[PDB]
Write a protein that binds this ligand. Structure first.
Ligand SMILES: Cc1cc2nc3c(=O)[nH]c(=O)nc-3n(C[C@H](O)[C@H](O)[C@H](O)COP(=O)(O)OP(=O)(O)OC[C@H]3O[C@@H](n4cnc5c(N)ncnc54)[C@H](O)[C@@H]3O)c2cc1C
Ligand SMILES: Cc1cc2nc3c(=O)[nH]c(=O)nc-3n(C[C@H](O)[C@H](O)[C@H](O)COP(=O)(O)OP(=O)(O)OC[C@H]3O[C@@H](n4cnc5c(N)ncnc54)[C@H](O)[C@@H]3O)c2cc1C
Ligand SMILES: O=c1ccn([C@@H]2O[C@H](COP(=O)(O)OP(=O)(O)O[C@H]3O[C@H](CO)[C@H](O)[C@H](O)[C@H]3O)[C@@H](O)[C@H]2O)c(=O)[nH]1
Ligand SMILES: O=c1ccn([C@@H]2O[C@H](COP(=O)(O)OP(=O)(O)O[C@H]3O[C@H](CO)[C@H](O)[C@H](O)[C@H]3O)[C@@H](O)[C@H]2O)c(=O)[nH]1
Lengths: 361, 365
């Protein structure tokens, strides 16, 4: 048999599969999807363009440890993602910065001046709890309306006041002129795509890969010691406490007969269209092609779980599940879905590494 | 008694495995298809390289068949790009057509024979053979010693490490000799490449919920604890029976892939080198895939003794060794052998598919 049965071949499951196997363990990693990599899986479309079938996946981290780790399995294309937001018929920097405010209102404030201007408009909040509070308390009611309110309502189906502060706190507000989506120390894409990096990661002879397979389809007749489950929690426990909310997305992919379609990798639509944004994969990968491929993101209530929904009622409901999980003797939970945390890739990696260390000492 | 488990454990994700998996699953059987490699499709696997060029890591794979049955079957899993492969052979510093034909003869010897003449020409140089048995017989008896030496003897010696006389007639008889001006490598009814590659086609083929795909796994690593009713084996026969009769010869290959900053390196899909270099041939994938790209990627093939089994070696000595293993296989109760490696048959893609499909109809009987 195996020492470990890992459910989910994304970062959480693949990072652990790699570490355990590098330390002698015999690992069987399985996934219900026909491919590995989970959400970060990438492949070439019919036109021969490299794309992310599950939406834009830009790698960024502040962890020297995380970056040096991945570096063992892939070279890097230096890349700092940038996003424009379609507001009032323009394409403006988001996160909001000096340039956003100046171009929108036709002002000419310096950075020093825009700090006072924000001050003069930000609503005061006794205690910031909601996604509305974080933004409104920093940059006033108007900017909140034009950049965050609409987008949030469309993405989650919930007003920012029905969401925890951490959600819209992901996008910081700047008084400077930095226009990168991330100020992280390390920002780079795997030179030949995520999938390629996962294959290196899972190359050990100590790793058996099983695809197109629900773990429940084999758990009964396959000898294993410990289980590492990276799927959704509520599903692991047959939805015993009811359905734990997970927001989902639909992706409509297109290929155009032109080299470039967008000014940058991603354009957000806070106040227009059904989709939240369009992305162009050549901006992100650096691939050269006579054509180009893009993807439109439509928020959905039903579908494969991609987003936990951070808010009081869901935090509580998860705690019920967390209780069962912590009780689950021979099963360790890790990942964005398994532990219900709005995590980026690097964060999942860290959580995985840390989980590996405990399982080791 | 223990678990019932999978109805079928299938070893190999090549055409032999995949076709039986799809057929079995579609019929309602639970299948676990396993392969020691980290990908499906066996030799026919294809992928994009670092440059973004669709290539065949295991050498050039051109699909051709005369079986309508087979073509329509594979058509269920992929659209087609019509392609008719054309090889050139480097002889006397020239690039001449092979199969040998009217143009090959005329251009090589600077002749002006008509089709009707090249027939009399061949007749006049052919060596007679009481009974054709070797690869030397099939050729020499048709186009003569000189053409044989120039197009076959050197190539064959390099590919197999054996003189054509040390190989069965069936080996070189694969390449027809022509009196017409056909320069196609195949004259089959249906010649086309899978529009988006073989891998895409295989994914559709193993996509059923009834099929579980296991990669990076030698069946021996699991056949001890995973329950299964019947096994379909598609690897080398001798290895299945622990070489209890000794190593069955299989020829291997080393592939050297290159990418060049040009649009096109070769006049055709493949160029053969019967009398030059270590490698037997070079191939440019864009000719075969139809892909558009500012660069191009090619593969050189180097015949090898040691390595992964790619070719059975048809000759009396080996046919005699295989026959013993064949009896073992025929005795194997809950084991079905099918494919190029598992039945020791020099088969093309379309042939293996056909053999799998037949195997399936028998299983369903
Ligand atoms: C649209 C989108 C864009 C994103 N962009 C970025 C970005 O730009 N930068 C960034 O850092 N992060 C981004 N992320 C977040 C990033 O994708 C996650 O941090 C990371 O993918 C989480 O990895 P994971 O392994 O924990 O979960 P996953 O990657 O989802 O892997 C979990 C796997 O578990 C499998 N599974 C679940 N249940 C079962 C079961 N029952 N049986 C078998 N298999 C099962 C699933 O099929 C899935 O493949 C983005 C996420 C989304 C949705
Ligand atoms: C260089 C080259 C070029 C070719 N070109 C053409 C062509 O142009 N046109 C054409 O029609 N045909 C071509 N062929 C032939 C074609 O590849 C074969 O007909 C076809 O691939 C045979 O399929 P198969 O499934 O029977 O064997 P394979 O495709 O080899 O699949 C067998 C699989 O079994 C796996 N396996 C074996 N033992 C084990 C084990 N112990 N545990 C787990 N897995 C195991 C192997 O890893 C392998 O993937 C070519 C072959 C080669 C080598
Ligand atoms: O223009 C915006 C952007 C965000 N928000 C709000 O702030 C939240 C967080 O925004 P994220 O971009 O971080 O949310 P995503 O998961 O949808 O985006 C993913 O894709 C992006 C690519 O553009 C980034 O790389 C990001 O880190 C990555 O997790 C949103 O849910 C929303 O409530 C807006 O109101 N307006
Ligand atoms: O120029 C040649 C070609 C062949 N032979 C001899 O005849 C045999 C049969 O030749 P193949 O080309 O058929 O050998 P392969 O299996 O290596 O070829 C594979 O690669 C080819 C790519 O051009 C074709 O697609 C072919 O059908 C495919 O199975 C060779 O082994 C050799 O003995 C030659 O002497 N000279």
């Amino acid at each position: 048999g195996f020492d470990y049965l890992i459910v989910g071949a994304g970062f959480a499951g693949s990072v652990l599969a790699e570490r355990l196997a590098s330390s002698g363990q015999r690992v069987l990693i399985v996934d219900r999807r026909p491919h590995i990599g989970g959400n970060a899986y990438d492949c070439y479309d019919d036109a021969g363009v490299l794309i992310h079938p599950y939406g834009p996946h830009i790698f960024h981290t502040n962890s020297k440890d995380v970056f040096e780790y991945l570096s063992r399995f892939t070279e890097w294309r230096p890349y700092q993602h940038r996003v424009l937001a379609s507001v009032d018929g323009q394409l403006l920097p988001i996160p909001i910065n000096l340039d956003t405010v100046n171009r929108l209102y036709g002002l000419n404030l310096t950075s020093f001046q825009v700090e006072e201007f924000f001050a003069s408009v930000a609503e005061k909040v006794e205690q910031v709890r909601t996604s509305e509070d974080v933004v409104v308390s920093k940059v006033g009611r108007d900017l909140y309306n034009k950049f965050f309110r609409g987008y949030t309502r469309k993405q989650w189906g919930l007003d920012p006041s029905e969401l925890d502060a951490s959600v819209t706190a992901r996008v910081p507000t700047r008084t400077n002129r930095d226009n990168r989506y991330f100020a992280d120390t390390y920002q780079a894409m795997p030179l030949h795509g995520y999938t390629r990096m996962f294959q290196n990661m899972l190359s050990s002879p100590n790793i058996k890969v099983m695809l197109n397979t629900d773990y429940r389809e084999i758990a009964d007749f396959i000898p294993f010691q410990h289980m590492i489950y990276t799927g959704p929690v509520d599903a692991f426990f047959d939805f015993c406490y009811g359905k734990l909310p997970y927001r989902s997305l639909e992706f409509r992919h297109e290929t155009h007969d032109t080299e470039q379609l967008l000014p940058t990798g991603t354009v957000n639509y806070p106040n227009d269209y059904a989709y939240t944004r369009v992305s162009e994969f050549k901006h992100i990968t650096g691939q050269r092609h006579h054509q180009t491929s893009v993807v439109y993101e439509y928020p959905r209530a039903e579908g494969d779980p991609y987003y936990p929904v951070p808010r009081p009622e869901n935090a509580e409901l998860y705690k019920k599940y967390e209780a069962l999980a912590d009780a689950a003797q021979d099963v360790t939970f890790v990942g964005r879905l398994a532990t219900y945390r709005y995590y980026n890739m690097d964060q999942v990696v860290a959580q995985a590494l840390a989980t590996f260390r405990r399982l080791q000492g």
